[PDB]
């Protein structure tokens, strides 16, 4: 069940955390206006696969891309099962 897809998301998380917040934030700072340029032409060397936007939120149980909920961390199908067994604390059917 989507082993390659979960592997790509794990590799994306590892590569983004490795190459980001040590170089990418500085490149974005120099890209921002100080409060063509040789500085920005030196800047334009960025690789691609380190980006945080390439990551997609997948369910930890099943790896499902769609229907994700961030506070629970699972897709809706798994969230309903965990709620019905009673694993998510404070979850109740809003009968309002």
């Amino acid at each position: 069940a989507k082993q390659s897809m979960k592997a790509r998301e794990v590799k994306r998380v590892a590569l983004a955390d490795k190459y980001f917040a040590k170089r990418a934030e500085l490149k974005a700072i120099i890209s921002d206006v100080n409060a063509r340029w040789n500085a920005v032409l030196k800047l334009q060397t960025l690789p691609r696969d380190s980006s945080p936007s390439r990551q997609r939120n997948r369910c930890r149980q099943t790896g499902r891309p769609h229907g994700f909920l961030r506070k629970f961390g699972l897709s809706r199908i798994k969230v309903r099962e965990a709620a019905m067994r009673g694993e998510i604390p404070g979850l109740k059917k809003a009968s309002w």
């Binding site: 890209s31 921002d32 206006v33 063509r36 920005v40 334009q44 060397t45």
Partner: peptide, 9 residues
Amino acid sequence: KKGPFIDLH
């Protein structure tokens, strides 16, 4: 406006 784009290769 702060940068045009061109691939390095």
